[PDB]
Symmetry: C3
Subunit: 445 residues, 3 copies
């Protein structure tokens, strides 16, 4: 549980090390069941307000079912199509005429029962709401009369809460075309999810992990609507399987590196691209460019490999030797020098240029460091905030070791007269190759 | 209902054809009404818990009205300003002193009634919640006493549900500055919306369409807050009018096209830009660059022309002849060769470069295709998933015809020594013009 | 309250002036308290449905507390870490064993009381929900029996509403890792927030401002979960402090400026970058590049300085003299000429190129202006909508003065043969310097 940060002065970048991986590589699918009541509208002599409250709920219930049935025949398309084929496969099995009865019968005596789908692709089925049993046990005998009979209020509220979960579930499937992510607590109770985690083909270690990061598991799960057939409402919930565990992860931070010439329009800049999370995965490195695809629970990084590029392990060389032959490190160039700061795990990178007031302060002691023009780094030890111009940033107070790797800023190795100063995506090699070829045109002349 | 896909090996792009359009070109505006009760706080001898529950709800009701009245006098600005002038126009008419009474009186006997606004811009008005009638019929006679009289519980809950819809409506207008999109089910019941679709100046064909894509209609509608005046809460709901129907739409997919030289830093790449949806519209083509502005209901593409650029129909030529004189096809160049895949409607494009393990598998049969370095395509027939490195993608299982257009990759037509290898937005012509001009500098020397 | 717009024909950009600032520079922190009941599950002879309804609510209550306690020991990381150190600091103080009792005792007799945290960093503490007092006063004496005693229904519902706020608060902290923004009405009642604004070390002027922009204050606040200890649920709410007030703000709008040659692929374009809001701040200018970081309440611009870059006041010179020596104005070049429009505060910029039908219409009079190829501007006076191709935009109807600054489009000053026509981020100087250096290579030859 030990974090480490290295800051490379030569490239104006920092690496936060010591994290452990939890990369999603597979899916576990479960069928969630809602037993429903098949009742067609029935009109009897009703004036008792209590009977009028049922009529209100009973109609909401009707509309919800029909609205769900209408979402099924409408073939909504989702951007999630690439990630739900394993779950969509289970939905299609449930369509076959045999299969719904096999679930409905397998779940008569319990709330949870393993079921075979005849593939036999075997699922774990859940009954989370039993409105059929409810309506039939306490409601229909009352309103199966020539004149509506008078129920009682406690039964009304017990119904409203039960029905409230239905309506909210339909509302979520409706606005999202039968595919939602994260999986809301209406789709799956925190208790229900923990029960679901306890009955999977994973080690007791993996159960503890998913049980301790319940919130992250939801955010990386999918809920898929299947069918309303034979008094049953079934939807498949797709849960992540983390096949990459305890492999090194590190986060890369970058800031602009510019020369500090006093003259207007005389400065060149470069920045390392591909900031984000890197984790070892199957002899390669999984890179997550997008911010927030990965979730962190202390020391551990939960990511979906679907949001990643695969790079050779040689990519790490860009942090110790950026001019190397093996990997084409990547940079963008410019002449844009605005002061900025990046809050790292254990400190802050500060790129100060021009007349900007860049400083680092301690709440009790005041300013404890003033940054000069250039790219610099400050540990979070004894530091509370960093200020760039009129902007103030809080420094993370996580405990760990910071290592400041001293080195000449590489930007000083370039002749500003021939520098390609507007590259949006260029290797060190492309830039170098490109300067050597432009210097020959001047050589002959 | 027949989809078709063409993959152009020469340009590493694919076109999914056969879709039909439903482009939003106009707006239909309706006034939604909530009859409210004007009651100032009244204190009487009250200890009966039941009377205490009303006091709780009655205060929530008061605060909601005042919070809405305060949102009106505060002149919040929304990014939606460009799209709601037709609805905002109706709100301003309702401000005039005459007009609210004309709605309030026109809706005395019904829940729905067409109204003339004296423009006369004629709207369809809706009463969806009648709290005035309610509070006055069952509540005020009870609490119009020197000592609070004792109501009954069934009336309490009937009030709470009715008031719950109010509070949620105000909450949505509050966090969004009186303009919301989509239109939530609290703003408009699924039943209410279907009733609203049935009373519009559109053909029975257009009614069926909007009735079958209710969820899409919401996501492309706006709800605009107007006034709280004379015991009436009115807001305008803006519904889409699709004036472009049944015109061809196609989606363009692109992937990087690179040379496959074994040498480090010896490879050049290009990619076609402007991936997204194209639909015929009024002799031109409407292009939707942004992902998810358009919504698909099988075979049909629902888009808002407000999120589009207008291009000449000559833009389609970039798919059959990318070097043509008529249209300046567009590409971005680089030397960045990371393996990637794009899931198309009926298959997958795979750009494999370097040491990456790119494959396509069938769930039962295993790997059925291994991709070589370069850009390739695989039909979804007999294919379940595609794998690039450590990343696994599900292939869409939609049925349709795939056509593989064989052709020499255009990247092989360029001399890497003079290639402009860092262009972020360049026509084929700009690149070509630009290579011919750089080859002359070498010609003279 | 007077807005002003200037359109610079020479650069195809417009500036909307006359706005006043309200920039967030500090934070005010308050502790929100929920008194909770410590009751372990108790089983007694219960069949009375009413007693069964408590059991349902009583278990929801239990699960909510444990789910909150589990979020605390799990050390979720949030992207908000940089902005909540002042609030997180208060959470850590509350961890110390002494401190919770000092709050719990300080709030025994009131709902609101100022408290000293022994720093002494003094906070204002709030009790917003008292479930301990409730459960113990009306529930536990009933169910403290050898056989469950029979409660009454009015007490049940009063509990459900009170408990409903708890469950929703936990749900929000759970999905967001104990840090949420905006601060929902479940975290803080509109009444509670206004009460909180009235008890702060700010002038009666600042109170009126925050009280009139309650909705904006929420959207710029944070809610941070602290502890569940000693029958108390405490979370810190972070409220914005606007230290920059009534300083000039202006919004910059830009559109592409292209030549209008009839020949295919003969046209060059440039656009000014850095569109967005600029406000005077401490002798510099705060720039907000991101759309929607800033919120506008009429005439006034609410922004968080955390989302801004700091620029010298010389940046305004890019609107009157874009070739000046003092500031390196910034532009991007291309040969991409698609017609577009930008809706400004008091008008619309229209960049019309090619065969595009660009027009401006009045609802009653029809088309009142047709735009020629080039960049043009139209006031919102007598104008209702602008149309570019198949796209229709509503013009803002705000009242103000528009000034059309005539001038030669700067794009005509460049020789297309040597123009760097694919720059994504380049100063006027870089482009100029760069053309002078490329013209010398032709001079010698």
């Amino acid at each position: 549980q030990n974090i480490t940060e290295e800051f490379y002065q030569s490239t104006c970048s920092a690496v936060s090390k010591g994290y452990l991986s939890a990369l999603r590589t597979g899916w576990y699918t479960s069928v969630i069941t809602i037993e429903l009541s098949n009742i067609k509208e029935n009109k009897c002599n009703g004036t008792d307000a209590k009977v009028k409250l049922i009529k209100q709920e009973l109609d909401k219930y009707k509309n919800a079912v029909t609205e769900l049935q209408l979402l099924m025949q409408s073939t909504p398309a989702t951007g999630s199509g690439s990630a739900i084929c394993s779950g969509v496969a289970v939905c299609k099995v449930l369509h076959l005429e045999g299969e719904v009865n096999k679930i409905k019968s397998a779940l008569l005596s319990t709330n949870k029962a393993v079921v075979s789908l005849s593939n036999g692709v075997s699922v774990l089925t859940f009954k989370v709401l039993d409105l059929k049993n409810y309506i039939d046990k306490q409601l229909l005998p009352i309103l199966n009369k020539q004149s509506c009979s008078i129920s009682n209020i406690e039964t009304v509220i017990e119904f409203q809460q039960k029905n409230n979960r239905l309506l909210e579930i339909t509302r979520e499937f409706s606005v999202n075309a039968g595919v939602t992510t994260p999986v809301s607590t209406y789709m799956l109770t925190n208790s229900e999810l923990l029960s679901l985690i306890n009955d999977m083909p994973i080690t007791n270690d993996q159960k503890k992990l998913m049980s301790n990061n319940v919130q992250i598991v939801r955010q990386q799960s999918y809920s898929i609507m299947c069918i309303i057939k034979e008094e049953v409402l079934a939807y498949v919930v797709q849960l992540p399987l983390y096949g990459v565990i305890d492999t090194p992860c590190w986060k890369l931070h970058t800031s602009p590196l510019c020369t500090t010439n006093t003259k207007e329009g005389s400065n060149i800049c470069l920045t390392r691209t591909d900031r984000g999370w890197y984790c070892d995965n199957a002899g390669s490195v999984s890179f997550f460019p997008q911010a927030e695809t990965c979730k962190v629970q202390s020391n551990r990084v939960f990511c979906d490999t679907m949001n990643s590029r695969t790079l050779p392990s040689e990519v790490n060389l860009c942090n110790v030797d950026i001019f190397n032959p093996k990997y084409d490190c990547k940079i963008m160039t410019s002449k844009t020098d605005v002061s900025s700061s990046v809050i790292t795990s254990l400190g802050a990178i500060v790129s100060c240029y021009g007349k900007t007031k860049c400083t680092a302060s301690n709440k009790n002691r005041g300013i404890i460091k003033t940054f000069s023009n250039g790219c610099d780094y400050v540990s979070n030890k004894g530091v509370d905030t960093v200020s760039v111009g009129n902007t103030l940033y809080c420094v993370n107070k996580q405990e760990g070791k910071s290592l400041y790797v001293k080195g000449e800023p590489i930007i000083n190795f370039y002749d500003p007269l021939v520098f390609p100063s507007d590259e949006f995506d260029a290797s060190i090699s492309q830039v170098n190759e490109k300067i050597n070829q432009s210097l020959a045109f001047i050589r002959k002349s």
